[PDB]
Design a protein around this ligand. Structure first.
Ligand SMILES: CC(=O)N[C@@H]1[C@@H](O[C@@H]2O[C@H](CO)[C@H](O)[C@H](O)[C@H]2O[C@@H]2O[C@@H](C)[C@@H](O)[C@@H](O)[C@@H]2O)[C@H](O[C@@H]2O[C@@H](C)[C@@H](O)[C@@H](O)[C@@H]2O)[C@@H](CO)O[C@H]1O
Lengths: 306, 306
């Protein structure tokens, strides 16, 4: 089976780290950061890595039952799996699939149905993934909400993410921090089963990022969100399971109207893209442009400069 | 080019009428109501129909600029397209792409960024698709919110849907009404350019629906939501654009563990599925089962009983 990537254009695709569309392609130097996202991680032959799962809408959602923290507007959620089965904390994953992979405050809504009579309720809620109560690997997290009485125990409860918030007397755009992983077990333990950090290894190369702007809900948040693979590419590799014939697939980005190649890039078998460029750059592309697999090369292939 | 459907299982796929996962397959008699959804509509050779677009996360989202209605907590939104380009009310589509295709109250969050300084804000908000102000074909809708002063004019504003609500001392589960289309032009005009209504046309057949349960945010809503095609099938057909060799594709639903066919169904070229069954039925399926295209058949093919 021949390897392929989707022909969907960048704006026709979805960010793999938050449920929002892609907006653009971005390249920048990453030496100052550790680039180790856990969502949007998939090998080219369809092996999911880290906390990656297949659904574009389950990214950064949580499901489970909640318990009120008396005297506050906070609730603890005991997590269930994404299909309401028991959560298994012994699975060899860093955290439940789809768990956020950055430190920040995510605002959205908590919703609940009472199974007995079908009564429902929904409240604005925020989860702070850097807080000591954020322990998804252990099966528990905390939300700050807009009620101190409405949610019931023993009832299915869902968190739908919307955007990010920034608080404090800190500098503008100081949070979220998209390249800092939460501690999935809080302070009890270190992160386990992580998808590896990625970095360019060939001279003159940088990572190529698929970038979106997260909605902001309060303050002055850093809304940039970069993923290594579109979610639709994850679904595609997962289904095709095309075997890699070398360590690097050469892709060309093509304009369909003219047939002309705009740039070329390396898709590494372990699931990330590099380009030959130095410095921060928002790539200028035709709206109908798309990526096309052209051939198998090695890690020492010299790309045409972007 | 041979026709194929995705091998993703039902639980690995997304509802095409609301941004939530599929949960199950359902069949029932549909003679009493009109089955004319506008999202999740696509031919097998990849022509999108109705208000259908490619992104799972832009379903029931709105974008545009907002203006406050004095003396209230309501805002009018002047709609933009999903990539912030101007919306053209003269295109031969029923309403902007991704516009909700059922009458009900959809609750979510309105979020806004001030372009000049990166300040952000977000509020709970509801849009009632059956109300007199819901005129998305004409380019405007109204939101009910919990503020009367916070949103700014002339700034990009996004609505992220979360769930549905039901109000009043009315009968439980009376709304939403998933098979009643909004009037996209309100009372000024009638709906146009709709994807056709669908019905079984062969004796003993019923529609097969891909079913989800919408989150409920208030009251006693009817949370069932049936789509004709999973969103991933829409993206797949759009990309492949395989020619239809007859009006009916025979699909088999297969258990990969045993290799045995569980049931068969007809995928019609114009984009919906039928099965041979009479009565309301929640299909019981193995979690790893999937659809497989087997052959093009003629108009006289009789399906094996489901
Ligand atoms: C606390 C509670 O259950 N309240 C009931 C109330 O329902 C609340 O109505 C107010 C409007 O004043 C808000 O819409 C609340 O969101 C709503 O509470 C929601 O819905 C109820 C049924 C529960 O599921 C709750 O968990 C959830 O937060 C209700 O008012 C009636 O029903 C509501 C939904 C609305 O349609 C009203 O117009 C209507 O009078 C009353 C009477 O049924 O009962 C209260 O106990």
């Amino acid at each position: 089976k021949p390897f392929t990537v989707p022909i969907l254009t960048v704006e026709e695709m979805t960010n793999s780290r938050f449920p929002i569309p892609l907006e653009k392609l971005f390249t920048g130097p990453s030496g100052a950061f550790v680039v180790q996202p856990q969502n949007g991680r998939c090998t080219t032959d369809g092996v999911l890595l880290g906390t990656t799962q297949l659904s574009p809408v389950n990214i950064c959602t949580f499901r489970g039952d909640v318990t009120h923290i008396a005297g506050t507007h906070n609730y603890t959620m005991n997590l269930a799996s994404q299909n309401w089965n028991n959560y298994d904390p012994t699975e060899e994953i860093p955290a439940p699939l789809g768990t956020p992979d950055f430190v920040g405050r995510i605002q959205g809504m908590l919703t609940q149905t009472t199974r007995g009579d079908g009564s429902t309720r929904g409240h604005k809620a925020t989860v702070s993934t850097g807080d000591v109560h954020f322990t998804p690997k252990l099966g528990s997290i905390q939300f700050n909400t807009d009620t101190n009485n409405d949610f019931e125990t023993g009832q299915n409860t869902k968190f739908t993410p919307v955007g990010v918030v920034q608080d404090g007397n800190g500098a503008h755009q100081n949070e979220p921090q998209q390249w800092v992983l939460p501690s999935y077990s809080g302070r009890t333990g270190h992160n386990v089963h992580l998808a590896p950090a990625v970095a360019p290894t060939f001279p003159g190369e940088q990572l190529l990022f698929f970038r979106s702007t997260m909605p902001g809900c309060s303050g002055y948040p850093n809304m940039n969100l970069d993923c290594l693979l579109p979610q639709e590419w994850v679904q595609h590799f997962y289904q095709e399971a095309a075997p890699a014939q070398s360590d690097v697939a050469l892709l060309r980005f093509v304009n369909p109207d003219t047939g002309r190649v705009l740039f070329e890039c390396k898709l590494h078998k372990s699931g990330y893209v590099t380009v030959a460029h130095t410095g921060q750059h928002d790539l200028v592309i035709p709206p109908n442009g798309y990526f096309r697999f052209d051939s198998w090369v090695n890690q020492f292939y010299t790309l045409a400069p972007m």
